[PDB]
Ligand binder design. Structure first.
Ligand SMILES: Cc1cc(=O)oc2c(CN(C)C)c(O)ccc12
Length: 149
């Protein structure tokens, strides 16, 4: 699979993160990210995708050692961690055809797994509008514990 790069943007308090809402197959909330072009560097893909989806340029903020990276069905996804962005920042997707909304969310109130259906005696997971973000929440919390306390 083709690797994807993007960003976990936090506010000044480290309480809140920035999520984007897609359409159709991407109909819930996730971190801004996308597939890398041929010969494009990780950090440049990250800045490009985040800019298309939020109107915020992260080029001069990226720390090349500061990221979280997961494999998800044999696709690599790396999100660079960008702390200290004020909540009064104007965001503005370029691609209005891809992005329905942008909003800040409380990290402690976000879920880190989806719920089962054992109250109903049925296998699988109940739907969750944070499906795309969920895998990154627990790594993010641990990474923040370590780097800050
Ligand atoms: C929209 C856009 C196109 C592109 O190819 O690269 C970008 C980069 C990366 N460097 C500067 C080339 C940005 O930092 C910010 C925006 C873009």
């Amino acid at each position: 699979g083709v690797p994807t790069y993007g960003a976990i943007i936090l506010d000044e308090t480290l309480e809140n993160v920035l999520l984007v809402q897609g359409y159709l197959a991407k109909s819930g909330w996730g971190f801004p990210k996308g597939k890398v072009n041929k010969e494009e560097a990780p950090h440049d893909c990250a800045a490009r995708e985040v800019f298309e989806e939020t109107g915020f340029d992260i080029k001069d903020y990226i720390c090349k050692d500061d990221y979280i990276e997961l494999r998800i069905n044999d696709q690599l996804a790396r999100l660079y961690i960008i702390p200290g962005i004020p909540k009064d920042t104007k965001f503005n997707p370029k691609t209005r055809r891809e992005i329905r909304n942008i909003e800040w969310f409380s990290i402690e109130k976000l879920p880190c797994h989806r719920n089962d259906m054992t109250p109903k005696s049925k296998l699988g997971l109940a739907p969750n509008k944070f499906f795309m973000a969920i895998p990154f929440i627990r790594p993010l919390r641990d990474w923040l514990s370590r780097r800050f306390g």
